[PDB]
Design a protein around this motif. Structure first.
Motif, short mmCIF file in Angstrom:
data_model
loop_
_atom_site.label_atom_id
_atom_site.label_comp_id
_atom_site.label_asym_id
_atom_site.label_seq_id
_atom_site.Cartn_x
_atom_site.Cartn_y
_atom_site.Cartn_z
N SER A 61 0.66 7.40 5.78
CA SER A 61 1.46 8.23 5.06
C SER A 61 -0.23 8.15 4.62
CB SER A 61 2.70 7.71 3.65
OG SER A 61 2.14 8.71 2.93
N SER A 62 -1.03 9.62 4.95
CA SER A 62 -1.82 10.20 4.20
C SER A 62 -1.75 9.60 2.27
CB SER A 62 -2.39 11.51 4.42
OG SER A 62 -1.73 11.91 4.01
N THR A 63 -1.15 10.20 1.67
CA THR A 63 -0.46 10.70 0.61
C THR A 63 0.44 9.11 0.14
OG1 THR A 63 1.98 11.62 1.73
CG2 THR A 63 0.40 13.38 0.31
N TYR A 64 0.08 7.68 0.39
CA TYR A 64 -0.02 6.85 0.09
C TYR A 64 -0.47 6.44 -0.77
CZ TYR A 64 0.73 1.31 -0.76
OH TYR A 64 0.79 -0.02 -0.77
N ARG A 65 0.05 5.86 -2.18
CA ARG A 65 -1.33 5.18 -3.29
C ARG A 65 -0.78 3.67 -3.95
NH1 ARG A 65 -1.26 10.28 -8.11
NH2 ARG A 65 -2.53 11.07 -6.15
N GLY A 85 4.39 1.21 -4.97
CA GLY A 85 3.52 2.25 -4.97
C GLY A 85 4.15 3.44 -5.11
N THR A 86 2.93 4.33 -5.14
CA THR A 86 4.15 5.86 -4.82
C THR A 86 3.55 6.31 -4.01
OG1 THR A 86 1.92 7.33 -5.79
CG2 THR A 86 3.67 5.44 -7.83
N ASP A 87 4.18 8.19 -3.63
CA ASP A 87 4.36 8.21 -2.34
C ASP A 87 5.07 10.18 -2.77
OD1 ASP A 87 3.26 9.45 0.18
OD2 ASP A 87 4.10 7.41 1.34
N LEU A 88 5.16 11.13 -1.59
CA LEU A 88 5.58 12.05 -1.55
C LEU A 88 6.88 12.11 -1.36
CD1 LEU A 88 2.86 15.37 -1.62
CD2 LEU A 88 3.79 13.72 -3.56
N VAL A 89 8.74 12.01 -2.05
CA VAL A 89 9.64 12.37 -2.08
C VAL A 89 10.46 13.75 -2.17
CG1 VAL A 89 11.91 10.49 -2.02
CG2 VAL A 89 9.76 10.06 -2.90
N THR A 98 9.99 18.98 -3.54
CA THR A 98 9.24 17.35 -3.41
C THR A 98 8.08 16.72 -4.90
OG1 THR A 98 9.24 17.64 -1.22
CG2 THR A 98 7.02 16.17 -1.66
N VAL A 99 8.57 15.51 -4.51
CA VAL A 99 8.27 14.67 -6.44
C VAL A 99 7.04 13.70 -5.55
CG1 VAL A 99 9.89 15.71 -7.53
CG2 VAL A 99 10.16 13.97 -6.72
N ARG A 100 6.28 12.91 -6.72
CA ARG A 100 5.66 12.29 -6.73
C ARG A 100 6.76 10.82 -7.34
NH1 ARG A 100 1.25 9.60 -4.10
NH2 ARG A 100 0.18 11.80 -3.90
N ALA A 101 7.33 9.68 -6.38
CA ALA A 101 7.55 9.12 -7.42
C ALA A 101 7.38 7.78 -6.77
CB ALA A 101 9.19 9.07 -6.94
N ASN A 102 7.90 6.32 -7.48
CA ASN A 102 7.58 4.83 -7.19
C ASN A 102 8.83 4.87 -5.97
OD1 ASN A 102 5.66 4.55 -9.54
ND2 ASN A 102 7.92 4.77 -10.89
N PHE A 140 13.47 7.00 -10.09
CA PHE A 140 13.42 7.90 -9.10
C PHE A 140 13.25 9.23 -9.69
CE2 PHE A 140 14.94 11.65 -6.59
CZ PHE A 140 14.11 11.47 -5.70
N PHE A 141 15.56 9.78 -10.63
CA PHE A 141 15.12 10.87 -11.32
C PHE A 141 14.57 11.37 -12.49
CE2 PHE A 141 18.63 13.51 -12.92
CZ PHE A 141 19.12 14.10 -11.55
#
Ligand SMILES: CSc1nc(N2C[C@H]3C(=O)N(C)C(=N)N[C@@]3(c3ccc(C#N)s3)C2)nc(C)c1F
Length: 387
Positions: A61-65, A85-89, A98-102, A140-141
């Motif tokens: 995943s290129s958007t993994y943090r 970590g966080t990523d786009l979900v 699409t959100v950036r979530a834990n 997430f919510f």
């Protein structure tokens, strides 16, 4: 109103849980995720496991943090440990956002992944108070509402089939709907009745009266909420505090006394079978739970049938079931077999939970589940447990 894109987006059953498809990362990695209102972490398998056919691959995943922080979660029936970590979900059959979530990337686990459940992670929908490692890990919510225009509400219609589903049938069958940001009127009949969310941690409610076939269990209402009462899609059974369970089982046995069942049946361990089509639903009582209403001194009731609290299981051509009411030392849990009777609205914005008769509840020609009110009920605040 009408949320056609989200109707019929769940699969599963009460015993193994209900799950929704989600995607994580860039490019998107599809996973099946357990819908859990009991919880508040989004946690996914992120390493090989004998019971997983897929898992989240962070290196792809290129958007993994990487949050550079571990998370260890031991609970009564199981455990898991992972890396935050966080990523786009996204939710393919959800809101078009699409959100950036834990994400807790699960690297080790014990009795967490269910063999044949078809889910690879869990979506904890409860509040930040019970998130791990602590309440600073935004659920997430909460992220979805903060980052988008999605209203702060979701609703669940969990659909029990009323009979066992084999491996192929459970994958091909519709298990219900999770409507994110709204209420879909096709999923219920009659009116929605709301009970306050007592406190925002679990989805905590207050039960003020319990009846078995209209007979009052007649316990001090504090007993029904000792030490809490919650709505939990991640629990299979209706779980009751020890003393309440003892009183309820005595009353259920008395109502069904024309047939004697072994002790193992009442313990929820042993199945009971009848010749195909002959299940004697009519000998089993209905169960009503009265919940605190939104108006002062007002309550309403939700009534379930044995078609909700007798869980279908495979044995033969017999129709077999397990008793899905069990004891708890951690308060009442309104699990999946309760939720299967109703469309349940988690109105976070208005701090309330709504119930209506589900359009997919299992019943017979003589009785149906019900949501009715109002009733005059005094001193309902006294039903809540403190300390
Ligand atoms: C006790 S604190 C806690 N608990 C959980 N879970 C508790 C499990 C738990 O017994 N029930 C009842 C729960 N509703 N959810 C959990 C589940 C694990 C497997 C499930 C299935 N099927 S549901 C996750 N997850 C996290 C992250 C926690 F902080």
């Amino acid at each position: 109103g009408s949320f056609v894109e989200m109707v019929d987006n769940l699969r599963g059953k009460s015993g193994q849980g209900y799950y929704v498809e989600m995607t994580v990362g860039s490019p998107p990695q599809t996973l099946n995720i357990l819908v859990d209102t009991g919880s508040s972490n989004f946690a996914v398998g992120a390493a090989p496991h004998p019971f997983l056919h897929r898992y989240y691959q962070r290196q792809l995943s290129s958007t993994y943090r990487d949050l550079r922080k571990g998370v260890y979660v031991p609970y009564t029936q199981g455990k898991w440990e992972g890396e935050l970590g966080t990523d786009l979900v996204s939710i393919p059959h959800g809101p078009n956002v699409t959100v950036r979530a834990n994400i807790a990337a699960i690297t080790e686990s014990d009795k967490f992944f269910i063999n044949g459940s078809n889910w690879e992670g869990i979506l904890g929908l409860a509040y930040a108070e019970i998130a791990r490692p602590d309440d600073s890990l935004e659920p997430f919510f909460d992220s979805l509402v903060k980052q988008t225009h999605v209203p702060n509400l979701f609703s669940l219609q969990l659909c029990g089939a009323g009979f066992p589903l084999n491996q192929s049938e459970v994958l091909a069958s519709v298990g219900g709907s999770m409507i994110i940001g709204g209420i879909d009127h096709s999923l219920y009949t009659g009116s929605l009745w709301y009970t306050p969310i007592r406190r925002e941690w679990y989805y905590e409610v207050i039960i003020v009266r319990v009846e078995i076939n209209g007979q009052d269990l007649k316990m001090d209402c504090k007993e029904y909420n000792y030490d809490k009462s919650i709505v939990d899609s991640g629990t299979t059974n209706l779980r009751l505090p020890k003393k309440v369970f003892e009183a309820a089982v005595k009353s259920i046995k008395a109502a069904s006394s024309t047939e004697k069942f072994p002790d193992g049946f009442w313990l929820g361990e042993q199945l009971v079978c009848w010749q195909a089509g002959t299940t004697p639903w009519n000998i089993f009582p209905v169960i009503s739970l009265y919940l605190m209403g939104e108006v002062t001194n007002q309550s309403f009731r939700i009534t379930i049938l044995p078609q909700q609290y007798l869980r279908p299981v495979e044995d033969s051509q017999d129709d077999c079931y397990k008793f899905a009411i069990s004891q708890s030392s951690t308060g009442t849990v309104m699990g999946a077999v309760i939720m299967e009777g109703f469309y349940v609205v988690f109105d976070r914005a208005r701090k309330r939970i709504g119930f209506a008769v589900s359009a997919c509840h299992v019943h017979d020609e003589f009785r149906t589940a019900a949501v009715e009110g109002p009733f005059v009920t005094l001193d309902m605040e006294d039903c809540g447990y403190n300390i």
